[PDB]
Each structure stands twice: as structure tokens, then as C-alpha cells.
Amino acid sequence: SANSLLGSLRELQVLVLNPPGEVSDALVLQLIRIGCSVRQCWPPPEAFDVPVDVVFTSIFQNRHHDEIAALLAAGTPRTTLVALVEYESPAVLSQIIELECHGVITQPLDAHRVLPVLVSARRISEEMAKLKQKTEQLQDRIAGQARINQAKVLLMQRHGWDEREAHQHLSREAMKRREPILKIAQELLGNEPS
Amino acid sequence: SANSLLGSLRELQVLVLNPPGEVSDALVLQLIRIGCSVRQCWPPPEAFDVPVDVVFTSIFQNRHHDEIAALLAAGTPRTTLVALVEYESPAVLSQIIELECHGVITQPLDAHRVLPVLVSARRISEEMAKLKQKTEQLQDRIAGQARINQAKVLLMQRHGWDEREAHQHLSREAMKRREPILKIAQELL
Amino acid sequence: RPLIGLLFSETGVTADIERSQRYGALLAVEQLNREGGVGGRPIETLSQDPGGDPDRYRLCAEDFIRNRGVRFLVGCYMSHTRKAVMPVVERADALLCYPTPYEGFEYSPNIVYGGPAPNQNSAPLAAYLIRHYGERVVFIGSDYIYPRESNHVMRHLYRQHGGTVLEEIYIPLYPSDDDLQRAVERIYQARADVVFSTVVGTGTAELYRAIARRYGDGRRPPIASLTTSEAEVAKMESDVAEGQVVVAPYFSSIDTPASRAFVQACHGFFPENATITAWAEAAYWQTLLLGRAAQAAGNWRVEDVQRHLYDIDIDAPQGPVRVERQNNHSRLSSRIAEIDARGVFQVRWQSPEPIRPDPYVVVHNLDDWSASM
């Protein structure tokens, strides 16, 4: 919701992943005026040790590129990403595309750019993440039905059972073992197969 | 794809849906320097007329908001949306959220802010459209797989055939009647 | 220099409040000169009239900076006029004092906010109205950003505390008699317990008179407003104004030594067409703060003067005020008054201590005010 998105900003945990300096100070102070919980962080760590909702990062061409790209790829699925951009040139815009930013702030930044990009980027990252998840849920379901299907067919052949028997066995085995019916299929299976 | 995205900016058809004036002017001039096909329109129409890939608009507290909203609600979902924003207060921001922009440019606008926002917003809208397309494909696929599997069990059990035999038969009839395996399967069911 | 540019309309829809802001600053400049000017010389002022037009505030702001060497400005009232000037002062590294209430959600390093953000006047007013008045509310505002943003906050507040927002009506700045008549008829058919007004400038007096006459005799719902000042109330007849509720850091009826000094300075300095208001008080204390900060810096450079202004407390006519370096907004008193039968503002509630500004707060917790109300 517009009101639930606007009302949740003060609970967001924000990280400013940028070398300490004027850009970083202003950015952190505006986020503190908005009311977000904020922290700056330089050199790029390997992993974040504390939960993070939104990351603000600069775009590097040296060794910090691969560090930032690896760290951010490790993050949680609803991590909002905003890029601090200083160039509109191909190598720089390609990196923003590759990082999958949800919003951009062009430099030099000032206080006025912050909130509109933050809210905006946050509805985008929330929508995208729900869409992605649904895709993943469908993929998972497709693969899982395939595996259960091939374990049933495996049981039919092995035992001379029809489908009902095969299905009955899997369920009974799954039900009384406290393991999903897909677990039994996988434990049964191992055709080194599909 | 970052490369193809950048390489296709000059074929984008961009509409500046905003009142005539300095803001529209400066925005249209920077979209022509970037190289996009750019038109400007005002008052908001009811349907586009010509295909539009990206719309830039402002946030109005009046009837153009609803017009613009309806205009893009009915429009092609791959139309990227960028809002020019001058206030950070809750009713204005709620308007941005309800329009579901793919990117924003806070005012006052200047040329440096345009290209980075147009590209990041375009990636965003295209990635959304792709996930929705994958969702439909996967929904259809799960359903298809089920009927191919229930039809296979049907043949297996009807004829005393193994899975492989049922699969060979489906494929054979399918590819002899120039139709999808799924059609054969649904015919059987 | 020391040359202060005064960017306040003398004409246009908010001329009555901006003329009094302008005189509050002029009065402070007169006082600053009697207290020694800056680095030996007298502080001068240069005034320009934008007529309530945002494009003209912009052009005059540019004229002040490009052609008059001005780097200190005191001005602006409606929020679109502040937005128009902000970029001009930010690019020049100038400083504007904005002695006016607003919607919050802004931070500029170049603007000193002397009037309340919504946590300092709308939130408390909401708490007050929900405690003492009916749950049926109709809203009426001037059609521009501030009334709209104010109403967005107010309607959420009423809906979340058991009330019903029966209608949100918008009339243009400078309404026609037709506009007023249609608005009033809708106010009357809605049958509210309270009228919440965000109507700004010319046409406020007439609106209130037309509400009064539409009901004739018979209980008429009271009008509570975030925007009506003393200048609009002075244009009303006594019985039209009676019972109305207004909010501000300052009212001219305050009976404190600092408030009485201010009233007497205004009565000896203001021309007759300029009524004392909360925004004249705001423009006054801000200009004084600025001149004193300049005397402490020993020069008239923005960086040096601005530094020193975050550290000086001012005993304003309203009470003690200070500007917080973290956000450029001010610690302000907050009062809700009811007009009596003789046009005088009777304070019915005042925040126990100055309210600290929090302009980006989204969720106003009205429970904050339950103990002092």
C-alpha cells in the first residue's frame, strides 16, 4: 500500500556502501532525517553481518567492481539497490544494468533526490521480488511433480503395481515418516536421471 | 543484454506527457541528444494513436492524474513510466506509488539526470514484463505436463504398456497428425 | 552588504499575511540597527513584490542574487513559491529564512525553516479536534499543494480515530463568488460537526461569512483551521469569527512581557493595512536571529553567519526558539485558540514545552498529546 510503504520507512535498515567523505555524510544525514536506520560501510565486506533492507552503492571500475557485484549477489531477495551514478557512459550504465539496481541517484547528490528515489526503488524491489518468487514457486512445483511422477512409474515397474497402488505407497510411506512425499520419491529415485 | 539494451535506445518511442513549457522543452531536447524518437503531448489523450515505449509525466493534483492513470492502465504493459517529481510529501509520493512508476527524476530537472534514469527504468519494466511472461509459460507448462502424464498412465494401464511405450505412442500419433503432444493427450482424456 | 532581501508579496492572494511577514522582518531590522548593526554599519533591506506568483518569486530571487549582491533573503509563503526560490538560493550558496508553516518533508542546507512542520501544528490540532468536537468532519481548502498535503494527513488521522471525512472540497486561490457559493452549499448539505479549513488568503473572510449566513440562526458547525491567521480574522465581523479555532506558535493576546513588547513594537511600526500575525512574529525572530548571528560572526558571509545561528537561542515573543543544526527546522511553541465575541484569540491549549521539529515523520501518534489535553 502507499500508506503501508510510506509508514514502513523508519523500520528500514539502510546501508551506504561508499568510501567515507562528503557524498557519504550527506547521504547518511538525509536518511537519518527521513528516519531510516542507517550505516555506512567501506571497503566492501564479503558478506553483511547484519540484516539489510536497502543498499546505496557507487559504481567502480577497479577491484571494487567484482567485490560489490559478489557481495550484492549474495544478499536477501528483497534487498532494494540504488546506484550513485557519476557517468552516463556505456561501461558505467552496463554495470548498473548488471547489478539490477531498482533506482539511481545522479551525482552530485543533494538531499532532495533521496526520498523520491528510496520510496520508488522500494516499491519496485517489492514488486519484482514477489514476481520472482512466484516464478520460483512454479519452477519448484514443476520439478517436484516430475520427480514424484518418475518415482511412481519406478514403483509400477518394480512391483507390478498400477498407478493407484504406486501413489498409495508413496503417500503411506511419506505420511508415516514425517517427510514430504517428494522426499520419498528422491530417496527412492536416483536414476542419476531427469 | 546491457549491450543490447543500450544499443536499442534510438528505436525507443518516447512521449513527454507534460504541459508545454521549459521543463518539457529541456526534457525533449535531452531525449533528442540521446537519440530516441520523442514526442510531447498535452492534454492527456484517451488512447495513444501511435505505439509508445516510454512515457515521462509529472504528478498533478487535478483531473490529469486520473486521465494519465487510466491512459497507462489500458496501455501496453511494456510502456516504461518515469515521473518528474517536485515534492517529497506523502500525497505526491502516494501518487507515484499508485501510478507504479519504473523510475523518477526529482526537480529541478537537468540533462545529467535523464539517461541513467531512462536506462535503469527501461531495464526494470522489461524485467517485470519477462517475469510475467515466464509466469504464464510455467502455469501452462505445469498444466500441460499433468495431462501428458495422466494420458500416459491411461495408455500404460489400458494397453499394458510401460512409460517409454506410452511416450513413444503419444509422440508418434502427435507427430503424424501435425499437432501438439498435449492435444493428443487431452483427446485421450 | 549587510543587505537583506525581503521576498514577500505586497499584492496577490496572500498579500495580507506576507505584508505582515515583511513588516515583522522590517521591525527586526530597525531593532538590529538600534542594537548596533553589523561590524559597525547599519543593516539595509531591499524588498521585491512577486504578487503571489511562483515564477515571479523565482525571477525576483535571481535579481536579488545576480544583480543586487544579496546572499541573505527572508521570504516566501505558499509552498510552490518556496520551491521556486529554493534552487536559486541553493545554487548561489545564499540563505533564505522561511518564516512560514508547511507540509514538511524537505531539507535544504540553504533554508532556515521558521514555521511549523505538521508534527508542530497539524498533529496537535488533530488531537484537539478529535477530543473536543464531533466525528463528522467536512474539509475545505484552497487548491494547491499545502491544503492537499495537509488534508491527506488530517483525513488519515480522523479515519484512524473513529471519525468520518464527509467531503474534501477544493476552491481556487482567489475564489469567485460562484466558487464560494457552490462550496458553501456542499458544506451545508454535508452536515458536519466541524469544518476543517485549509483555505489560504483572499476569500477566507468571505468564505467564513458565507458559511455563517448559509446557516442563519441554528447551530452552525465551528470552523477549525491550520491556515487562517489574525489578518483574515480582522476582516471578519465579530459574530462570524466567534467560536472559530486557529493554530499557531504565537497569538497577539499572549500576556507575557516578550509578547507585550512585540505588540507595542508592531503598533508603533506597522502601517494600518498590516495586521500583526504569527508569521510576522516568525519573520521577526528569524531576522533578529540572523542579525545577531552576523554580529557574533563579525562579518556578513553566509558560512560564518550560518554557523553561529545554530548556537544562538532567541527569546522570541512566542517563547524560546532555536534552530537545530541537524535539519534547519526550529523548536517552536504551539497554541490552539478559540475566537471570542470580541475578536480576541483565547488560547485553550499550548504545548507544555517547544515542540522539536520532525518534518519527515509519516505516522503522527496523537497519543503524544493526550496527557496535556
Place this chain on the structure above:
Amino acid sequence: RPLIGLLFSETGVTADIERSQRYGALLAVEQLNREGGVGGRPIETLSQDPGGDPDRYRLCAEDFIRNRGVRFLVGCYMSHTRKAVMPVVERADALLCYPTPYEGFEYSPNIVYGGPAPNQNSAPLAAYLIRHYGERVVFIGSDYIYPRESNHVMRHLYRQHGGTVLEEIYIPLYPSDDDLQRAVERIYQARADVVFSTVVGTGTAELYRAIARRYGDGRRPPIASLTTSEAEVAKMESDVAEGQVVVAPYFSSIDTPASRAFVQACHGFFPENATITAWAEAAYWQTLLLGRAAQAAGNWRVEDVQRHLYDIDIDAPQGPVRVERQNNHSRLSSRIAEIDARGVFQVRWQSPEPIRPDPYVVVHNLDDWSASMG
């Protein structure tokens, strides 16, 4: 006050080319002052040495604009030094002339771009290289945005036209000895047909000398550069420099009276440690344009001067130039030159006419250059 602020390093990694730009600009001022200055008043200049540091450029621009009333500036070389100054000039409504080649993708109402965008130098150079040299290439550039953006385009161009980019190497801006030796060994181990360099400033000469010695003083791959200037080639032994390839709008060897007049003027005015370069040429013509636009306006108001700028096509040493009002970039000649044994720049190809600037073009169509090069 007709006062031009000159923001060019005197010290630091690009000190040679920027001293070259400073004297080109000073040469123009002097000529403008012999033509009547600006309405009877002589044109003055103010110089500060930012030493190739982007933060010092910003500070010098800020001093000039804030404390000296400067509204007209000439300066900046490496792109991040331009980025550091840009915002200061835009907030003050000042005008900066940037007489430097760059990566493109920029439009600033307050910047007059006197050096080529990629469609004016890299593209033609790419066509040329793919046409005459083998398609296995090795890249070496200084580690900052311009060489990186320039490599981003060249990498894509070679792969599209059947080439192989074997190694893409970056060295720091003031490269240590080890940096060079490691870089040259990689270049030597790749066995490339061509070396495409984007190395800029101090260390360029040493780089080319180390490539030279490294190879078995034998039919090394030629070095083609987008960055090397006459200032770098003068520090090179004759045999190292020989056969190397370089691109620019201007070369001191141009065979015209206009070019001849510029050489002579530079020889009798520039110090001993300030070589003529294409960027001295650009500082000269831009600074000259400023003066004539001001003379035509009758004043020194940015607005008045600026208006008269797009209308004055000048006769520069390189040939005829103009500034386009649509994008603040210029119509520039483009020459590709091969250095002979006596250190002289032999122009091998020239665009038939000045190339119109298109700073945002993403797909450089190399076929554009087929007719004029083959």
C-alpha cells in the same frame, strides 16, 4: 571584468599536455588583445595549478568563481577532473571550454566541448585499425574512466568485426617500474598484431620504450593510441616512436598556411618545456572563439557571449570549426597519423570533412568510413 580562468595542471601526471593547453589559451588571449580586447578592455587571465587532482580542480574552480568573480573558464583534461568542476560552473551560470577528447555521453549547458567525442576519433581509428592491422589486439590503458570507456567501445568493435582482444591491461596513472615491467611482459606474452594504448600522461614514453626493448628489436606489433600526444612522442627515442599510430584533429605537420601560422606563433611564445599538441590547438581556437563572441556581444555577460558563440564558425589551425547549439560539441576535423623515423607525424587518413559530433551514439557503424579509407 573580462577575466578568463585557466584550469590546467602545471604539475602531475598530465602536466605536459595541460601546460600545452595553457599556452595555447594564452596565445589566443594575446592575439585577442591585439584585436581590441573586449570593448577596449584587455582580456586578463588567472591560472592555478590543480596538479591533476580532481579535488584540487574543484577547489580552484570554486576559488575563481566565488572569490575572483570569474565566469569564463578554460581547463580540465582527464574526465574525472571535468566531472569535479562541472557542477561548480553550472551552479554559477559560468561557461567552461573543455578542449579535450572524451568518452561522450554528456550534455552540459555550461560546457563548450572543443575536443572530439568517440564518433569523431575512436570510431574512425577503429575502422582504420581493423582495415590495416591484424585482428589480434592487446589493450593497455591507464586505470581511470576514459581509457575504460574507450576500451569498452573498442573491445566491442573488434569482436564485432572478427577480431580477438587477447589481453586488456590497466596500469595506475603514475605507474611504478614494476607496473610497467609486468604490463610489458603480458603484452609480449600475448603475441598481438597490434597494441591499442589508452595510457595517458607521464609513463607513456617509458611504456613505449619498454615495449620496444622487450621485443627482440624486431617487427614488434605497432602501437596505436587514442591518447598519446606530440608531448609524449618528443620524450621518445627516434626508433621507439617510429611507426607508432596516433589520432587527433590537428598535427603540427599539417600542410596549410593556417597550420604554418600556428606553429610559428607557438614556437615564438611557448616555453622550452611546452610542446605543441592537438589540445594546445583546441585551447587556442576555443579561447579565440570566446574573445570574438565577446567582441560581437560588446560585453562579458555569459548570456550575451554565449548566444554569439554558435554563430561564429572559426578558421582554426586544424581547419574550419564550429560549435553546435544543439549539443555544445564541435564540428572537428579528424586525422590519423603515423610517426616517421625523424619523429614527425605523417597524416595517413583524414575525414573528407569535419565530423559532426554525436556524443550519445551507442552503435558506431564502421561502414561510414569505408569510402574514405579504402
